[PDB]
Coordinates of N, CA and C and ligand atoms in Angstrom, one line a residue:
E587 N -11.0 -14.4 16.6 CA -11.3 -13.1 16.0 C -10.3 -12.9 14.8
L588 N -10.8 -12.4 13.6 CA -10.0 -12.0 12.5 C -9.1 -10.9 12.9
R589 N -7.8 -11.1 12.7 CA -6.7 -10.1 13.0 C -5.8 -10.1 11.8
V590 N -5.6 -8.9 11.3 CA -4.6 -8.7 10.2 C -3.5 -7.7 10.7
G591 N -2.3 -8.2 10.9 CA -1.2 -7.4 11.5 C -0.2 -7.0 10.4
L592 N 0.3 -5.8 10.5 CA 1.4 -5.3 9.6 C 2.7 -5.9 10.0
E593 N 3.4 -6.5 9.0 CA 4.7 -7.1 9.1 C 5.8 -5.9 8.9
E594 N 6.9 -6.0 9.6 CA 8.0 -5.0 9.4 C 7.5 -3.6 9.8
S595 N 6.6 -3.5 10.8 CA 6.0 -2.2 11.1 C 7.2 -1.2 11.5
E596 N 8.2 -1.7 12.2 CA 9.3 -0.8 12.7 C 10.1 -0.3 11.5
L597 N 10.1 -1.0 10.3 CA 10.7 -0.6 9.1 C 9.8 0.5 8.4
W598 N 8.5 0.2 8.3 CA 7.6 1.2 7.7 C 7.7 2.5 8.6
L599 N 7.8 2.4 9.9 CA 7.8 3.6 10.7 C 9.0 4.5 10.5
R600 N 10.2 3.9 10.2 CA 11.4 4.7 9.9 C 11.3 5.5 8.6
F601 N 10.4 5.0 7.6 CA 10.1 5.7 6.4 C 9.0 6.8 6.7
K602 N 8.0 6.4 7.6 CA 6.9 7.3 7.9 C 7.5 8.5 8.6
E603 N 8.5 8.4 9.5 CA 8.9 9.6 10.2 C 9.6 10.6 9.3
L604 N 10.1 10.2 8.2 CA 10.7 11.1 7.2 C 9.6 11.7 6.2
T605 N 8.5 11.1 6.3 CA 7.4 11.2 5.2 C 7.8 10.2 4.1
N606 N 7.0 9.2 3.9 CA 7.4 8.1 2.9 C 7.0 8.6 1.5
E607 N 7.8 8.2 0.6 CA 7.6 8.5 -0.9 C 7.6 7.2 -1.7
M608 N 6.8 7.0 -2.7 CA 6.9 5.9 -3.6 C 6.9 6.5 -5.0
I609 N 7.9 6.0 -5.8 CA 8.0 6.4 -7.2 C 6.8 5.8 -8.0
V610 N 6.2 6.7 -8.9 CA 5.3 6.2 -9.9 C 6.0 6.5 -11.3
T611 N 5.8 5.6 -12.2 CA 6.4 5.7 -13.6 C 5.3 5.2 -14.6
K612 N 5.6 5.6 -15.9 CA 4.8 5.2 -17.0 C 4.5 3.7 -17.0
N613 N 5.6 2.9 -16.7 CA 5.5 1.4 -16.8 C 5.2 0.8 -15.5
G614 N 5.3 1.5 -14.4 CA 4.9 1.0 -13.1 C 6.2 0.6 -12.3
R615 N 6.2 0.9 -11.0 CA 7.3 0.6 -10.1 C 6.8 -0.1 -8.9
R616 N 7.5 -1.2 -8.5 CA 7.2 -2.0 -7.3 C 7.5 -1.1 -6.1
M617 N 6.9 -1.4 -5.0 CA 7.0 -0.6 -3.7 C 8.2 -1.1 -2.9
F618 N 8.8 -0.2 -2.2 CA 9.7 -0.6 -1.1 C 9.5 0.4 0.1
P619 N 9.2 0.0 1.3 CA 9.0 -1.4 1.6 C 7.8 -2.1 0.9
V620 N 7.8 -3.4 0.9 CA 6.7 -4.2 0.4 C 5.6 -4.3 1.5
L621 N 4.4 -4.1 1.2 CA 3.3 -4.4 2.1 C 3.2 -5.9 2.4
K622 N 3.3 -6.3 3.6 CA 3.2 -7.7 4.1 C 2.4 -7.7 5.3
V623 N 1.4 -8.6 5.4 CA 0.6 -8.8 6.7 C 0.6 -10.2 7.1
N624 N 0.3 -10.4 8.4 CA 0.0 -11.7 9.0 C -1.5 -11.7 9.3
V625 N -2.1 -12.9 9.2 CA -3.5 -13.1 9.3 C -3.8 -14.2 10.2
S626 N -4.7 -14.0 11.2 CA -5.3 -15.1 12.0 C -6.8 -14.9 12.1
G627 N -7.5 -16.0 12.3 CA -9.0 -15.9 12.6 C -9.8 -16.0 11.3
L628 N -9.2 -16.3 10.2 CA -10.0 -16.8 9.0 C -10.5 -18.2 9.3
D629 N -11.5 -18.6 8.5 CA -11.9 -20.0 8.5 C -10.9 -20.8 7.7
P630 N -10.1 -21.7 8.3 CA -9.0 -22.3 7.5 C -9.6 -23.1 6.3
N631 N -10.8 -23.5 6.4 CA -11.5 -24.4 5.4 C -12.1 -23.5 4.3
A632 N -12.4 -22.2 4.5 CA -13.1 -21.3 3.6 C -12.1 -20.9 2.5
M633 N -12.6 -20.4 1.4 CA -11.7 -19.8 0.3 C -12.0 -18.2 0.3
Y634 N -10.9 -17.5 0.1 CA -10.9 -16.0 0.2 C -10.0 -15.5 -0.9
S635 N -10.3 -14.3 -1.4 CA -9.3 -13.5 -2.2 C -8.8 -12.3 -1.4
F636 N -7.6 -11.9 -1.6 CA -7.0 -10.7 -1.0 C -6.8 -9.6 -2.1
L637 N -7.4 -8.5 -1.8 CA -7.4 -7.3 -2.7 C -6.6 -6.2 -2.0
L638 N -6.0 -5.3 -2.8 CA -5.2 -4.1 -2.3 C -5.7 -2.9 -3.1
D639 N -6.1 -1.9 -2.4 CA -6.2 -0.6 -3.1 C -5.6 0.5 -2.2
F640 N -5.7 1.8 -2.7 CA -4.9 2.9 -2.1 C -5.9 4.1 -2.0
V641 N -6.1 4.5 -0.7 CA -7.2 5.5 -0.4 C -6.5 6.9 -0.3
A642 N -7.0 7.9 -1.1 CA -6.5 9.3 -1.0 C -6.7 9.8 0.4
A643 N -5.6 10.4 1.0 CA -5.6 10.8 2.4 C -6.1 12.2 2.6
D644 N -6.1 13.1 1.5 CA -6.2 14.5 1.7 C -7.1 15.2 0.7
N645 N -7.7 16.3 1.0 CA -8.4 17.2 0.0 C -7.5 18.2 -0.7
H646 N -6.2 17.9 -0.7 CA -5.1 18.8 -1.2 C -3.9 18.0 -1.6
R647 N -3.0 18.6 -2.4 CA -1.8 17.9 -2.8 C -0.6 18.5 -1.9
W648 N 0.5 17.9 -2.0 CA 1.7 18.2 -1.2 C 2.8 18.8 -2.1
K649 N 3.7 19.5 -1.4 CA 5.0 20.0 -2.1 C 6.1 20.0 -1.0
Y650 N 7.3 19.7 -1.5 CA 8.5 19.6 -0.6 C 9.2 20.9 -0.8
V651 N 9.2 21.7 0.2 CA 9.7 23.1 0.2 C 10.6 23.3 1.4
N652 N 11.9 23.7 1.2 CA 12.9 23.9 2.2 C 13.0 22.7 3.2
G653 N 13.0 21.5 2.6 CA 13.2 20.2 3.3 C 12.0 19.8 4.2
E654 N 10.8 20.3 3.9 CA 9.6 20.1 4.7 C 8.4 19.8 3.7
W655 N 7.6 18.8 3.9 CA 6.4 18.6 3.1 C 5.3 19.6 3.6
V656 N 4.7 20.3 2.7 CA 3.7 21.3 3.0 C 2.5 21.2 2.1
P657 N 1.3 21.6 2.5 CA 0.2 21.7 1.5 C 0.6 22.4 0.2
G658 N 0.3 21.9 -0.9 CA 0.9 22.3 -2.2 C -0.1 22.6 -3.3
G659 N -1.4 22.8 -2.9 CA -2.4 23.2 -3.9 C -3.6 22.3 -3.8
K660 N -4.5 22.6 -4.7 CA -5.8 21.9 -4.8 C -5.5 20.5 -5.4
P661 N -6.3 19.5 -5.0 CA -6.0 18.1 -5.5 C -6.4 18.0 -7.0
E662 N -5.8 17.1 -7.7 CA -6.2 16.6 -9.0 C -7.5 15.7 -8.7
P663 N -8.3 15.6 -9.8 CA -9.5 14.7 -9.7 C -9.0 13.3 -9.3
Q664 N -9.8 12.6 -8.5 CA -9.4 11.2 -7.9 C -8.9 10.3 -9.0
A665 N -7.8 9.6 -8.8 CA -7.3 8.5 -9.6 C -8.5 7.5 -9.8
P666 N -8.6 6.8 -10.9 CA -9.7 5.9 -11.1 C -9.5 4.7 -10.1
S667 N -10.7 4.1 -9.7 CA -10.7 2.9 -8.9 C -9.8 1.8 -9.5
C668 N -8.7 1.6 -8.8 CA -7.7 0.5 -9.2 C -7.7 -0.4 -8.0
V669 N -8.0 -1.7 -8.3 CA -7.8 -2.8 -7.2 C -6.8 -3.8 -7.8
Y670 N -5.9 -4.2 -6.9 CA -4.9 -5.3 -7.2 C -5.4 -6.5 -6.5
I671 N -5.4 -7.6 -7.3 CA -5.8 -8.9 -6.7 C -4.5 -9.7 -6.4
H672 N -4.4 -10.1 -5.1 CA -3.2 -10.8 -4.7 C -3.1 -12.1 -5.6
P673 N -2.0 -12.4 -6.3 CA -1.9 -13.5 -7.2 C -2.2 -14.9 -6.7
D674 N -2.1 -15.1 -5.3 CA -2.5 -16.4 -4.7 C -4.0 -16.6 -4.7
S675 N -4.8 -15.5 -5.0 CA -6.3 -15.6 -4.9 C -6.9 -16.5 -6.0
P676 N -8.0 -17.2 -5.8 CA -8.6 -17.4 -4.5 C -7.8 -18.5 -3.8
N677 N -7.9 -18.6 -2.4 CA -7.1 -19.6 -1.7 C -7.7 -19.9 -0.3
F678 N -7.4 -21.0 0.2 CA -7.9 -21.4 1.6 C -7.5 -20.4 2.7
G679 N -8.3 -20.2 3.7 CA -7.9 -19.6 4.9 C -6.5 -20.1 5.4
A680 N -6.3 -21.4 5.3 CA -5.1 -22.0 5.9 C -3.9 -21.5 5.1
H681 N -4.1 -21.3 3.8 CA -3.0 -20.7 2.9 C -2.6 -19.3 3.4
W682 N -3.6 -18.5 3.5 CA -3.3 -17.0 3.9 C -2.7 -17.0 5.3
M683 N -3.1 -17.9 6.2 CA -2.6 -17.8 7.6 C -1.3 -18.5 7.9
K684 N -0.8 -19.3 7.0 CA 0.4 -20.2 7.3 C 1.7 -19.4 7.2
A685 N 1.7 -18.3 6.5 CA 2.9 -17.4 6.3 C 2.3 -16.0 5.9
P686 N 3.2 -15.0 6.1 CA 2.7 -13.6 5.8 C 2.4 -13.5 4.4
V687 N 1.4 -12.7 4.1 CA 0.8 -12.4 2.7 C 1.6 -11.1 2.2
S688 N 2.3 -11.3 1.1 CA 3.2 -10.2 0.6 C 2.7 -9.7 -0.7
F689 N 2.5 -8.4 -0.9 CA 2.1 -7.7 -2.1 C 3.3 -7.3 -2.9
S690 N 4.2 -8.2 -3.2 CA 5.6 -7.8 -3.7 C 5.5 -7.3 -5.1
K691 N 4.5 -7.8 -5.9 CA 4.5 -7.6 -7.4 C 3.6 -6.4 -7.8
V692 N 2.8 -5.8 -6.9 CA 2.0 -4.6 -7.3 C 2.9 -3.5 -7.8
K693 N 2.5 -2.8 -8.9 CA 3.3 -1.7 -9.5 C 2.4 -0.4 -9.5
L694 N 3.0 0.7 -9.0 CA 2.4 2.0 -9.0 C 2.8 2.8 -10.2
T695 N 1.8 3.4 -10.9 CA 2.0 4.1 -12.2 C 1.3 5.4 -12.1
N696 N 1.7 6.3 -13.0 CA 1.1 7.6 -13.3 C 0.5 7.6 -14.8
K697 N 0.3 6.5 -15.4 CA -0.3 6.3 -16.7 C -1.1 5.0 -16.7
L698 N -2.4 5.1 -17.1 CA -3.2 3.9 -17.5 C -2.6 3.2 -18.7
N699 N -1.6 2.3 -18.5 CA -0.9 1.7 -19.6 C -1.0 0.1 -19.4
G700 N -2.1 -0.3 -18.7 CA -2.5 -1.7 -18.5 C -1.6 -2.4 -17.5
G701 N -1.7 -3.7 -17.5 CA -0.7 -4.6 -16.7 C -1.0 -4.8 -15.3
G702 N -2.3 -4.5 -14.8 CA -2.7 -4.7 -13.4 C -2.0 -3.7 -12.5
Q703 N -1.7 -2.5 -13.0 CA -0.9 -1.5 -12.3 C -1.9 -0.6 -11.6
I704 N -1.4 0.1 -10.5 CA -2.3 1.0 -9.8 C -1.9 2.4 -10.2
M705 N -2.9 3.2 -10.7 CA -2.7 4.6 -11.1 C -2.8 5.5 -9.8
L706 N -1.7 6.3 -9.6 CA -1.8 7.3 -8.5 C -1.5 8.7 -9.0
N707 N -1.9 9.7 -8.3 CA -1.6 11.1 -8.7 C -0.3 11.5 -8.0
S708 N 0.7 12.0 -8.7 CA 2.0 12.6 -8.2 C 1.6 13.7 -7.2
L709 N 2.3 13.7 -6.1 CA 2.3 14.7 -5.0 C 1.0 14.6 -4.3
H710 N 0.3 13.5 -4.3 CA -0.9 13.1 -3.5 C -0.5 12.0 -2.5
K711 N -1.0 12.1 -1.3 CA -0.8 11.1 -0.2 C -1.8 10.0 -0.3
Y712 N -1.4 8.7 -0.1 CA -2.3 7.5 -0.2 C -2.0 6.7 1.0
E713 N -3.0 5.9 1.4 CA -3.0 4.9 2.5 C -3.4 3.5 1.9
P714 N -2.5 2.5 1.8 CA -2.9 1.2 1.5 C -4.0 0.6 2.3
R715 N -4.8 -0.2 1.7 CA -6.0 -0.8 2.3 C -6.1 -2.2 1.7
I716 N -6.3 -3.2 2.6 CA -6.4 -4.6 2.1 C -7.9 -5.1 2.4
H717 N -8.5 -5.8 1.4 CA -9.8 -6.3 1.5 C -9.7 -7.9 1.4
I718 N -10.4 -8.5 2.3 CA -10.5 -10.0 2.2 C -12.0 -10.3 1.8
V719 N -12.1 -11.0 0.7 CA -13.4 -11.3 0.0 C -13.6 -12.8 0.1
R720 N -14.7 -13.3 0.8 CA -15.0 -14.7 0.9 C -15.6 -15.2 -0.4
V721 N -15.1 -16.4 -0.9 CA -15.6 -16.8 -2.2 C -16.8 -17.7 -2.0
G722 N -17.7 -17.6 -3.0 CA -19.0 -18.4 -3.0 C -20.0 -17.9 -2.0
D723 N -19.9 -16.7 -1.5 CA -20.7 -16.2 -0.4 C -21.9 -15.4 -1.0
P724 N -23.2 -15.9 -0.8 CA -24.3 -15.1 -1.4 C -24.4 -13.7 -0.8
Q725 N -23.8 -13.4 0.4 CA -23.8 -12.1 1.0 C -22.6 -11.3 0.6
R726 N -21.7 -11.9 -0.2 CA -20.5 -11.2 -0.7 C -19.8 -10.4 0.4
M727 N -19.6 -11.1 1.5 CA -18.9 -10.5 2.7 C -17.5 -10.0 2.3
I728 N -17.2 -8.8 2.7 CA -15.8 -8.3 2.6 C -15.4 -7.7 4.0
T729 N -14.1 -7.9 4.3 CA -13.5 -7.2 5.4 C -12.4 -6.2 4.8
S730 N -12.3 -5.1 5.4 CA -11.3 -4.0 5.0 C -10.5 -3.5 6.2
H731 N -9.2 -3.6 6.1 CA -8.2 -3.0 7.1 C -7.4 -2.0 6.3
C732 N -7.2 -0.8 7.0 CA -6.2 0.3 6.6 C -4.9 0.1 7.4
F733 N -3.8 0.6 6.8 CA -2.5 0.5 7.4 C -1.8 1.9 7.4
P734 N -2.2 2.7 8.5 CA -1.7 4.1 8.5 C -0.2 4.2 8.6
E735 N 0.5 3.2 9.1 CA 2.0 3.2 9.2 C 2.5 3.2 7.7
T736 N 1.8 2.9 6.7 CA 2.2 2.6 5.3 C 1.9 3.8 4.4
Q737 N 1.3 4.9 5.0 CA 1.0 6.1 4.2 C 2.3 6.6 3.4
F738 N 2.1 7.1 2.2 CA 3.2 7.6 1.4 C 2.7 8.7 0.5
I739 N 3.6 9.5 0.0 CA 3.3 10.5 -1.1 C 3.8 9.8 -2.4
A740 N 3.0 9.7 -3.4 CA 3.4 9.3 -4.8 C 4.3 10.4 -5.4
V741 N 5.4 10.1 -6.0 CA 6.3 11.1 -6.6 C 6.8 10.5 -7.9
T742 N 7.2 11.4 -8.9 CA 7.9 11.0 -10.1 C 9.4 10.8 -9.8
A743 N 9.9 11.4 -8.7 CA 11.3 11.4 -8.3 C 11.3 11.7 -6.8
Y744 N 12.2 11.1 -6.1 CA 12.3 11.3 -4.6 C 12.6 12.8 -4.4
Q745 N 12.0 13.4 -3.5 CA 12.1 14.8 -3.0 C 13.1 14.9 -1.9
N746 N 13.0 14.0 -0.9 CA 13.7 14.0 0.4 C 15.0 13.1 0.1
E747 N 16.2 13.7 0.2 CA 17.4 12.9 0.0 C 17.5 11.8 1.1
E748 N 16.9 12.1 2.3 CA 17.0 11.0 3.4 C 16.1 9.8 3.0
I749 N 15.1 10.0 2.1 CA 14.3 8.8 1.6 C 15.1 8.1 0.6
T750 N 15.7 8.8 -0.3 CA 16.6 8.2 -1.3 C 17.6 7.3 -0.6
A751 N 18.2 7.8 0.5 CA 19.3 7.1 1.2 C 18.7 5.9 2.0
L752 N 17.5 6.0 2.6 CA 16.9 4.9 3.4 C 16.5 3.8 2.4
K753 N 16.0 4.1 1.2 CA 15.5 3.1 0.2 C 16.7 2.2 -0.1
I754 N 17.9 2.9 -0.2 CA 19.2 2.2 -0.6 C 19.6 1.4 0.6
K755 N 19.6 2.0 1.8 CA 20.1 1.3 3.1 C 19.4 0.0 3.3
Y756 N 18.0 0.0 3.2 CA 17.2 -1.2 3.7 C 16.9 -2.1 2.5
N757 N 17.1 -1.7 1.3 CA 16.7 -2.4 0.0 C 18.0 -2.8 -0.7
Ligands
O0P2131 C1 -14.9 -7.2 11.5 N1 -15.2 -6.8 12.9 C2 -15.9 -7.9 13.7 C3 -15.2 -9.2 13.9 C4 -14.1 -9.6 13.1 C5 -13.7 -10.9 13.1 C6 -14.2 -11.8 14.0 C7 -15.2 -11.4 14.9 F1 -15.6 -12.3 15.7 C8 -15.7 -10.1 14.8 S1 -14.8 -5.4 13.6 N2 -14.1 -4.4 12.4 O1 -13.8 -5.6 14.6 O2 -16.0 -4.7 13.8
O0P2132 C1 16.2 -3.8 12.4 N1 15.5 -2.8 11.6 C2 15.6 -2.9 10.1 C3 14.8 -3.9 9.2 C4 15.2 -4.0 7.9 C5 14.5 -4.8 7.0 C6 13.4 -5.5 7.4 C7 13.0 -5.3 8.7 F1 12.0 -5.9 9.1 C8 13.7 -4.5 9.6 S1 14.7 -1.8 12.4 N2 13.4 -2.6 12.7 O1 14.5 -0.7 11.5 O2 15.3 -1.6 13.5

């Protein structure tokens, strides 16, 4: 059976319990923690691409008020469809399964300034989603897994000083 497991789940959960935040910048900022997954049950002989996108979690935005994240207003119009292609793509099932797949180079941005960056709206919550695309498939089969442990609020600056300290402690 195809199984995609989150790596370092106990690290993501220490961010999630505070409410996780990721910085967005004009030029784009790498994530911490990095999304990494283990994969089993692909065809080792087949070729696949790995794609990453970010699904908007809410019909509203968030605000950090008195040390608490609370509903913060109506949402901005949805960020454009941005998909990140894992740079090892396309590659054999055996390649994806032999070691964890790490999205270490994806950059989150608040400006369409090119460079394969993912545009997100500040003070909106997102959930990472990985797609596995089979190459040369006339049915264009895709699989999609969501990672609820990895939800975060996009910010231009950290709101929670405990997040600022955790990012420094573990990174
Ligand atoms: C994708 N699903 C079916 C499946 C995945 C992999 C191998 C299988 F033999 C069956 S799912 N989301 O569990 O319905
Ligand atoms: C031992 N912990 C920290 C950790 C740091 C960096 C990467 C990790 F996979 C785990 S933990 N799981 O929070 O207890």
